Amino acid sequence: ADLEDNMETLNDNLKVIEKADNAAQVKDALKKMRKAALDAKKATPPKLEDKSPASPEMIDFRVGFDELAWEIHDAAHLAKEGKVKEAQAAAEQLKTTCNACHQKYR
Amino acid sequence: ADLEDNMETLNDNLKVIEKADNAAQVKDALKKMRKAALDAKKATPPKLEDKSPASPEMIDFRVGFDELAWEIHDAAHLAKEGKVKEAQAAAEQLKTTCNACHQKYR
Amino acid sequence: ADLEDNMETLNDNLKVIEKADNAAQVKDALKKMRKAALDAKKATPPKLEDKSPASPEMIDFRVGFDELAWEIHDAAHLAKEGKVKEAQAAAEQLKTTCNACHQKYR
Numbered sequence: 001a002d003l004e005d006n007m008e009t010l011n012d013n014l015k016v017i018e019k020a021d022n023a024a025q026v027k028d029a030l031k032k033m034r035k036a037a038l039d040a041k042k043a044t045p046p047k048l049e050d051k052s053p054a055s056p057e058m059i060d061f062r063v064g065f066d067e068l069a070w071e072i073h074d075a076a077h078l079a080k081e082g083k084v085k086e087a088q089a090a091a092e093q094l095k096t097t098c099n100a101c102h103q104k105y106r
Numbered sequence: 107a108d109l110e111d112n113m114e115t116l117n118d119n120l121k122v123i124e125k126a127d128n129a130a131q132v133k134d135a136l137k138k139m140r141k142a143a144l145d146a147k148k149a150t151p152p153k154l155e156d157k158s159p160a161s162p163e164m165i166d167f168r169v170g171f172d173e174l175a176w177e178i179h180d181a182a183h184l185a186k187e188g189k190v191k192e193a194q195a196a197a198e199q200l201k202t203t204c205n206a207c208h209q210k211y212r
Numbered sequence: 213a214d215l216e217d218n219m220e221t222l223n224d225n226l227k228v229i230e231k232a233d234n235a236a237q238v239k240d241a242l243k244k245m246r247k248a249a250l251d252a253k254k255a256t257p258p259k260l261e262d263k264s265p266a267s268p269e270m271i272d273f274r275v276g277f278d279e280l281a282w283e284i285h286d287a288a289h290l291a292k293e294g295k296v297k298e299a300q301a302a303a304e305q306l307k308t309t310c311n312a313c314h315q316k317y318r
């Protein structure tokens with residue numbers, strides 16, 4: 001998928017998690033987010049398309065999705081145990097990682 | 107290890123999972139599969155030896171193993187919970203990631 | 213963080229795990245080790261400074277931290293279900309991964 005499609009997936013499912021009632025809804029949304037994070041790692045963002053593909057900034061961009069995926073998995077661990085409120089709070093804290101990348105490459 | 111050696115490991119241990127009768131067999135097979143997938147990330151496939159190491163195709167190839175590893179971990183979660191049948195069903199779904207990479211790059 | 217700071221975070225928190233008494237101490241040390249491992253993926257070791265960031269040595273180096281992060285997570289899985297001693301044993305086994313990278317790129 002496109003980078004923008006994957007960002008829409010991440011943004012939409014974060015809102016699904018915010019409004020969720022039960023753990024299975026949160027689990028499903030976090031799974032879509034993880035798939036979107038890994039697919040986005042394949043993209044070249046507009047900010048960097050004029051730099052070398054081997055540039056340190058492209059590596060910095062890709063590793064950011066490794067960090068996002070691992071943090072999503074931590075929230076998913078809480079959702080699998082049925083801890084809805086804790087999973088929702090951990091999902092909310094993802095936004096620190098979203099924003100950290102946006103400050104550099106948005 | 108060799109790219110083909112890592113593929114033999116993935117394939118041998120998928121066959122173990124297909125036939126397994128308990129969660130211990132599955133969990134040990136998935137652990138080997140994850141190690142082979144991560145090690146395969148370090149290789150250049152023959153069909154991409156004519157690409158730069160950070161070309162979009164080589165990124166697609168390497169991230170394909172991150173996707174495989176996360177999907178293996180999903181199956182391993184299920185096996186650690188005694189969901190042997192569900193873990194085996196997750197192993198079957200894994201094959202679409204195997205196939206998609208082979209279609210592009212084998 | 214720079215690579216040296218990430219390495220001190222790995223070293224320090226491995227020492228906490230060896231000395232820990234309960235699962236909360238082990239879980240929190242493993243979480244910091246994982247964050248440091250992923251942040252280290254973004255760095256260039258001094259022996260590879262003059263190489264392309266996408267050279268095979270640099271890919272080998274970055275995948276080394278994928279393997280370490282996944283091995284850290286296995287230890288966290290053991291600690292999260294309260295198997296403290298098995299988590300401590302697993303954390304001790306990580307050193308073979310630390311040492312393997314060191315022998316090549318330190």
Ligand code: HEC
Nearest residue numbers: 003004007010011045061064065068094097098101105106
């Ligand atoms: C880098 C490692 C990023 C992480 C982590 C996240 N995002 Fe992102 N985002 C990134 C870039 C380079 C861009 C610009 C390219 C583009 O798609 O526009 C974006 C953009 C968005 C957008 C707008 C998408 C669009 O319709 O154009 C959204 C809504 C967005 N990003 C949301 C988002 C969320 C919720 C994240 C964390 C869960 C997140 N992003 C992480 C780079 C990176």
Ligand code: HEC
Nearest residue numbers: 110113116117120151167170171174203204207208211212
């Ligand atoms: C890319 C991201 C791949 C994924 C995911 C999987 N495989 Fe693979 N495989 C890939 C390539 C580029 C090649 C060709 C290597 C070569 O030197 O020709 C292969 C090959 C195989 C083989 C045949 C090995 C041989 O001796 O020629 C097998 C049996 C195989 N792959 C199995 C396999 C399985 C079971 C996978 C998922 C569980 C899987 N592969 C994923 C690239 C990629």
Ligand code: HEC
Nearest residue numbers: 215216219222223257273276277280306309310313317318
């Ligand atoms: C590569 C994939 C590595 C893995 C895995 C681990 N380390 Fe590492 N380490 C690496 C390099 C290239 C270096 C040299 C850094 C430099 O700038 O010179 C290091 C260094 C250390 C150090 C010493 C730090 C210093 O004195 O500046 C320590 C204490 C250390 N590393 C610890 C450590 C541990 C405990 C690891 C596994 C849990 C580990 N490292 C993994 C590369 C890699």
Ligand SMILES: [Cl-]
Nearest residue numbers: 034072073076
């Ligand atoms: Cl997950």
Ligand SMILES: [Cl-]
Nearest residue numbers: 062168169274
């Ligand atoms: Cl990577």
Ligand SMILES: [Cl-]
Nearest residue numbers: 140178179182
């Ligand atoms: Cl696993």
Ligand SMILES: [Cl-]
Nearest residue numbers: 059160266271
């Ligand atoms: Cl890369």
Ligand SMILES: [Cl-]
Nearest residue numbers: 246284285288
């Ligand atoms: Cl972890």
Ligand SMILES: [Co+2]
Nearest residue numbers: 073179285289
């Ligand atoms: Co897990």
